Amino acid sequence: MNCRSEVLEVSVEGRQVEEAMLAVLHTVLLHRSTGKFHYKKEGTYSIGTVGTQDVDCDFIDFTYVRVSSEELDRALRKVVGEFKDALRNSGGDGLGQMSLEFYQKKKSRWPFSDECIPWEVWTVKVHVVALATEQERQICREKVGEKLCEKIINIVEVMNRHEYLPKMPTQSEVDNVFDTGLRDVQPYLYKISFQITDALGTSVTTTMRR
Template identity: 50%
Template structure:
């Protein structure tokens, strides 16, 4: 299976990295989640509703919409925090260097392994967010960045929604017995498609080793 791959690039101040990643990833997950399924039989089901909420950023003039699910929001925040902490560690090693990072949100489905106890993971959509962390030294620069990054982020969100509205591949709706091969069914209120979040950081991403954290699978994947 060939995965559809998208790459978004943006340069932001260090204080804006977290909100940038959260706003883009939550927009993607909003389009890649469903309400909980209630099965009435192996081939019949009804779909619950998804609650949504507005989130206003502190360091960017921007408001985004996310699913109002504490479980999902905590999972995404945990992995974005890991990314931020690795950025800080790298910054301590290279205080005057422009750092770059790639955070990847990968959607996949599982296939039962024939000859092993492990399921095979088949990615079908990959979103790479390439971030350059700018070094801003004055409050005046930060105020300008707060406004300008908001405009850039709006453009990125538009690109995401435009791509989502196209007729691209998504896994077919599974039978009840196979729901957990396509969806993460562990959340009590929603069902996102199975996904991984990974990241890597370097002052030179070429040839660097990835620093990874994953959701929904024990398989760690390299960037495609």
């Protein structure tokens, strides 16, 4: 169950934070998901289809690929949205970080609790600058697009480089490994959190599925 933590750092403009974080999160979840398991008798199962689609960025000259799932997209857009607000609207040095953590549920023996054991952590350290000039914004569109392109391919190589994946679960064990709550995709169990540190202190936000 060797856990690996990877760190990515990006410097963007305020209007680029949301799209930049979405590119990273969707890219990771693209390679950390499966189709929905449809179980039959004797505990056997088939696997549903998962489409993908290109996403054109409006504030960055870049295009990324995400899982064709509105449910997942709305989930990610929400937490990235909270992050973008908490980060941009801060009187610090424009620094914050977001973590994507994949974990397994080791159900603590009846009846007390349930423990989350992480096996992969993906952290994005964001440095955001607020620009007013239209020209500078244009420079950032091209500049960030190049860097972000290099980092997406890089992150795909890193995921491929990781030697550990959870053992494929049986029907009774599927909810300890996968998020089986989405309609059209089945990612590994994941939680997303972010923290912003200011001159006043540190704020930490954790988001949980229903």
